[PDB]
Structures are given as structure tokens and as C-alpha cells.
Design a protein around this ligand. Structure first.
Ligand SMILES: Nc1nc2c(ncn2[C@@H]2O[C@H](COP(=O)(O)OP(=O)(O)NP(=O)(O)O)[C@@H](O)[C@H]2O)c(=O)[nH]1
Ligand SMILES: Nc1nc2c(ncn2[C@@H]2O[C@H](COP(=O)(O)OP(=O)(O)NP(=O)(O)O)[C@@H](O)[C@H]2O)c(=O)[nH]1
Ligand SMILES: *CCC(=O)Nc1nc2ccccc2n1CCc1ccccn1
Ligand SMILES: *CCC(=O)Nc1nc2ccccc2n1CCc1ccccn1
Ligand SMILES: [Mg+2]
Ligand SMILES: [Mg+2]
Lengths: 218, 208
């Protein structure tokens, strides 16, 4: 009995779409005075409750809320950052102005078709499970399959995150099984904490590097 | 009362999204034809958007009302002329008109390069709603001033007409939008209205 969007839910989603259009129109008018060199977009997905909203919020604002406010379908956050390409000496190259649009999808099945419609906008994916929830780790293969059927290129860039690493007493997912899974699919893996920020920026910067590197292959 | 999204509704929508991803990936791999042109049909539920596209792609019409489950699209390979013919692969998005799908369908406005906007010549409320639909397009399109072709559909139902041609021509004139009176049942002006939209979209990208 998945229920249809209430008009309050629908108002909230239409306002996200309204914000996204303003953003894309500013980018259409030679957007790529605070301006930038590229609008980079990616998308966070994974089961409900794993920490997708908290991870993006920790990354953009350095803050964390204990209270669970499940996401009404779709949202996004933004961050201006400076990206520097890598070479035989680390982050060697010139600093590029990157405007990040960080899509945040609801994890509950009831929003599956709404959220999948935004894969077309994503250049990369941040895939999360919860180190304290074995079911959310087991669903990772399904999520990856969904990404390969629904992304809008063929081998989409993904970074896997096992989140809530600060809850060490409640950990149930074994490190070797997760590392093996990421190894099997060739995707980078980070254990993260939205609560204290551990590996948040590293995981997102790796995804950003992957997308920039792919883009320079053209 | 409380009503629900069925798993069959969501499965059908996911299959459209799967088909759309497969198509864009095929266009990525040197996608044959010369351009993938996308446009989108919208308007109140029941005005005939699904019927109009089906008449255009297949030359057929179904009397029975099967409301669209959120989104679908059809495809057509056509030849466009500004010899002078270019091979165009058309993606024809078909949105559900009912409010319950407003957010799903609005997410696809950005994928469109032009819009086929419909009302029902026999439903005055659907003509009055045209202004609002134009607002949503301006607010959510790719493109501040998006190409729109307006269609007053069901012209074959002349004895149930309630929208006067002059009122409709006047509305379209206030916006600078081409207007066609169409029939999905017998095909009248269908191909003309879509070719007009295509021409607006082709001419616009050639201004580059
Ligand atoms: N201790 C701890 N709690 C976390 C962490 N990440 C999220 N949480 C908590 O777990 C709950 C769910 O997090 P939330 O970010 O909303 O998850 P979500 O992936 O967005 N869920 P949904 O898909 O329903 O929107 C919240 O109470 C949040 O505070 C983390 O790294 N550590
Ligand atoms: N006589 C006549 N009937 C038409 C015409 N166009 C559509 N219809 C009929 O009107 C009904 C609604 O058509 P349909 O294409 O399903 O409309 P829709 O705009 O796609 N509805 P929705 O937004 O709910 O998916 C159907 O019974 C269809 O046969 C037309 O030009 N003439
Ligand atoms: C998954 C397709 C891809 O490789 N890149 C991509 N994804 C996009 C989503 C929306 C708009 C544009 C998109 N691109 C093209 C830009 C790009 C190309 C290579 C690497 C990164 N980004
Ligand atoms: C402003 C004209 C317009 O709508 N362009 C548009 N719409 C797109 C939707 C999806 C992908 C790319 C799109 N573009 C840019 C290409 C284009 C197409 C037709 C006319 C002008 N530009
Ligand atoms: Mg969330
Ligand atoms: Mg329909």
C-alpha cells in the first residue's frame, strides 16, 4: 500500500524542481560576482536511514542532526569548491572553480520511480549503506544493478560508503566483506561518519576526481 | 480517502526510464541519424496527448480512454528540410495530465527541446488552464523562452466544441505561439503541428 504523494509532499518536491531550474538556467547563461568553471552534479542513493542526507549536510555545512528527518522524495545541496587535477606529484594542476550540485534521494521504495528520474542529471553516484545495518549492505548489489540499468552512461562512476563508522558498538558489517564487494566491482570504498566528518570529504573528492578525470578523456 | 501507488504503476514507470536510459546511451555511442530531437506533450488529463502522438507515429486511434501512468514516450525517424534533408530521430515524451503525477512529469520538462501543449476544444476548463501550463513551462524548461506549439484537439467533435477558434487564436497570439486545431481520431493537422514544432527547434539550434 505505497501511498501517493500528499499535496504537501508535492509542494516540497515542486520547490526542489523550481530551485534546480533556476540553477540550471544560471548555468545555461554561460554560468560555467561568484561564478565557476563547471557545474558538476552527482547523486546520493542507498536504503532509507543509512545517512545520505546527513553525509551531504556534514560535507556542505560541517553540522549534524541526531533527529531522523526522512527525505521527501528528492532534494539537493550545493558547494563551491576548488578542484586540482592530479599528476606525477600529487594535486599539481591549476585550481578550477567547481559548483557542486549534490542530489539527495529518498531511499524508501515509495519514491523509487521519482528518484530514478534524476539519474539522468547525475555525472557520478555516491552509494551508501549503514555499517550497523546488514540488510542495507546486502542491498548494495541491487543498487549497483539499478545504477547500471538506469545511469545515462555505461560504466557510471560510483564511490561506495559504509557510513556511521562512529557507532562502533553497533557495527555488524564486516570490513572484509565490504572491501571484497567494492573490489569485485572496481569502485572506491570509504568508511565514513556523518556525525564527525571522517572520510566524508575524501569520499566526495574521490568521486569528483573520477568525474573530472573522465571528462578530460575527451 | 487514502489512495496508493501500485507496484504495477511503478514498474511501468521504471520500464520507461530504463528505455530512456538505453536510448540516451545509444545516442552516446556515435548515434543512424544526425540529431536526437526531444519534445514533450503536456496539458490537462483527457485532452488527447497520448492519442495525438499515436496518430502521428502509427496512423491509428483508439476510442477507449487509457490514462497515462505518469510518463511514456514514442519514437519516430523522420526527414527534416529547412538533399536539404536531415535524418532526425524524434523522442516524443508523453506526460500524464493528472495532478498526482505533477512532480514526476515536471522532472522531464528539462529533457525537452520544445513542447506540444494541448487543450480540448470540447472542454473549456482545459483551455482556461493553458495559461498555467505555460507558466510551468517557463519556470521549469531548459530555456527561458521555450518553443511551444499549442493544439486545440478533438476538432472532429464539432457539435461539442465549446472553445471558439477566435478566442484560441487570440490567446496564442498574446504569447506568440503557433496554434493548430487538431484531431487525433482522423489525423487533421497532427503532422503539421509537430513539424511546426520541429522547425522551431531546428531553426533555433542553427542560430549557433
Ligand atoms: N551516529 C551516526 N548517526 C548517523 C550517521 N548518519 C546518519 N545518522 C543518523 O541516522 C538517521 C538517518 O540519517 P539520514 O541522513 O536522515 O538518512 P537518509 O539516508 O537520508 N534516509 P532517507 O533515505 O529516508 O532520507 C538520523 O537520525 C541521523 O542522525 C552517522 O554517520 N553516525
Ligand atoms: N473524438 C476524439 N476523441 C479523442 C481525440 N483525442 C483523444 N480522444 C479521446 O479522448 C480520450 C482521452 O484521450 P487520451 O489521449 O488518452 O488523453 P490524454 O491527454 O493522454 N490523457 P492523460 O493525460 O490522462 O494521459 C480517449 O478516450 C481518446 O480516445 C480526438 O481528437 N477526437
Ligand atoms: C554517465 C554519463 C557520463 O559519463 N557523464 C555525464 N553524466 C551526465 C549527466 C547529466 C548531464 C551530463 C552528463 N555527463 C556528461 C559530462 C561528463 C562527461 C564525462 C565525465 C563527466 N561528466
Ligand atoms: C533553449 C533551446 C533548448 O531547449 N535547448 C535544449 N533543450 C535540451 C534538452 C535536453 C538536452 C539538451 C537540450 N538543449 C540544447 C540543444 C538544443 C536543442 C534544440 C534547440 C537548441 N538547443
Ligand atoms: Mg534523506
Ligand atoms: Mg496519456
Amino acid at each position: 500500500h505505497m501511498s501517493f504523494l500528499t499535496e504537501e509532499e508535492q509542494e516540497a518536491i515542486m520547490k526542489v524542481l523550481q530551485r534546480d531550474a533556476a540553477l540550471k538556467r544560471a548555468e545555461e547563461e554561460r554560468g560555467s560576482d561568484g561564478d565557476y568553471d563547471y557545474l558538476i552534479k552527482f547523486l546520493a542513493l542507498g536504503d532509507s536511514g543509512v545517512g545520505k542526507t546527513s553525509v551531504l549536510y556534514q560535507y556542505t555545512d560541517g553540522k549534524f542532526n541526531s533527529k531522523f528527518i526522512t527525505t521527501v522524495g528528492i532534494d539537493f545541496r550545493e558547494k563551491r569548491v576548488v578542484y586540482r587535477a592530479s599528476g606525477p606529484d600529487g594535486a599539481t594542476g591549476r585550481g578550477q572553480r567547481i559548483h557542486l550540485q549534490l542530489w539527495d534521494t529518498a531511499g524508501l521504495e515509495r519514491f523509487r520511480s521519482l528518484t530514478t528520474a534524476f539519474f539522468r542529471d547525475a555525472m557520478g553516484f555516491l552509494l551508501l549503506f549503514d555499517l550497523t545495518n546488514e540488510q542495507s549492505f546486502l542491498n548494495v548489489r541491487n543498487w549497483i544493478s539499478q545504477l547500471q540499468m538506469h545511469a545515462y552512461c555505461e560504466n557510471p562512476d560510483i564511490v561506495l560508503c559504509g557510513n556511521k563508522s562512529d557507532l562502533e558498538d553497533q557495527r555488524v558489517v564486516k570490513e572484509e566483506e565490504a572491501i571484497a564487494l567494492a573490489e569485485k566491482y572496481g569502485i572506491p570504498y570509504f568508511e565514513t561518519s556523518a556525525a564527525n566528518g571522517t572520510n566524508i570529504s575524501q569520499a566526495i573528492e574521490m568521486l569528483l576526481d573520477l568525474i573530472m578525470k573522465r571528462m578530460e578523456r575527451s
